[PDB]
Amino acid sequence: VRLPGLAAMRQGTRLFTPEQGEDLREALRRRRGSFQTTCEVTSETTFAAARRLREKASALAALNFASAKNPGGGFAQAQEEDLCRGSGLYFSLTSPQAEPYYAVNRQSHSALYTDHLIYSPQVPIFRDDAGQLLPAPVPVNIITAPAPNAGAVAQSRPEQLPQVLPTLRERARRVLGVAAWMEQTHLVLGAWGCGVFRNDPAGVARTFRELLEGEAQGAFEHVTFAVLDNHPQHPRLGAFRRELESLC
Ligand SMILES: Nc1ncnc2c1ncn2[C@@H]1O[C@H](COP(=O)(O)OP(=O)(O)OC[C@H]2O[C@H](O)[C@H](O)[C@@H]2O)[C@@H](O)[C@H]1O
Numbered sequence: 001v002r003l004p005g006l007a008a009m010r011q012g013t014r015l016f017t018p019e020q021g022e023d024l025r026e027a028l029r030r031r032r033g034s035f036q037t038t039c040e041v042t043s044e045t046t047f048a049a050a051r052r053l054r055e056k057a058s059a060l061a062a063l064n065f066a067s068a069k070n071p072g073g074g075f076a077q078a079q080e081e082d083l084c085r086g087s088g089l090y091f092s093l094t095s096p097q098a099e100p101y102y103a104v105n106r107q108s109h110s111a112l113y114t115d116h117l118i119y120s121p122q123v124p125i126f127r128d129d130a131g132q133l134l135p136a137p138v139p140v141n142i143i144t145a146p147a148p149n150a151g152a153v154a155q156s157r158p159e160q161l162p163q164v165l166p167t168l169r170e171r172a173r174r175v176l177g178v179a180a181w182m183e184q185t186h187l188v189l190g191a192w193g194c195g196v197f198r199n200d201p202a203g204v205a206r207t208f209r210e211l212l213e214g215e216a217q218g219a220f221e222h223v224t225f226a227v228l229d230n231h232p233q234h235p236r237l238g239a240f241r242r243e244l245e246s247l248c
Contacts, residue, residue: 024177033218147193
């Protein structure tokens with residue numbers, strides 16, 4: 001039997017294409033300065049922060065650190081695979097209206113990828129980090145978008161090194177734009193493509209702070225930076241807790 005709410009979520013899945021770039025930013029324009037946005041930086045999985053936030057969240061979204069070319073990356077410690085294994089996310093990403101995101105990114109043949117985004121509405125979270133069933137599934141809206149593959153650019157197309165940060169910046173700005181366009185209140189963010197994609201975590205953390213301070217100030221009610229870091233150094237979390245203490 002097909003698990004609860006997968007149908008309604010897959011049927012509602014929706015693609016934002018790069019030609020919606022200005023539709024997304026006028027949605028940020030229109031929503032800027034609506035709340036006193038409270039923001040944290042934590043050590044939880046993105047789904048653990050989602051399930052915690054749920055009961056006081058009118059509209060909850062979370063960022064999938066996605067593969068540009070294969071849904072769920074093709075599966076093996078990554079965050080996108082954590083969400084697929086414990087939610088209906090995969091049934092949404094393989095949905096027909098989502099195909100152009102993968103199709104175009106592969107034809108792109110560029111490690112900075114395109115600006116397509118996939119919006120997955122009311123994705124059921126079925127399991128906690130331990131992997132046991134929840135009593136009841138917890139819905140979370142998911143924004144899927146690929147951070148530029150910095151590691152690949154450095155080994156494959158170093159001429160696009162200068163475009164890495166600008167790509168991540170305009171794409172981050174569209175991720176906020178999709179969440180305001182869908183009028184979300186509570187965002188679960190994190191160390192976006194600072195793992196397998198090898199971006200600088202100080203840089204991703206700073207880009208988020210620039211946006212949350214600039215074009216997206218006030219635009220959301222709560223932003224939680226759910227960075228998981230098991231390495232004894234904790235380099236990712238340290239960079240996000242260090243660079244976003246200004247904002248909290
Ligand atoms: N479940 C998790 N929850 C919250 N944060 C996490 C989690 N797992 C890792 N992090 C933290 O977030 C950081 C980045 O996690 P990454 O999964 O590497 O995303 P990317 O931007 O580097 O590239 C995504 C590729 O990886 C896959 O193959 C995709 O299919 C893509 O191909 C990690 O270092 C953790 O600190």
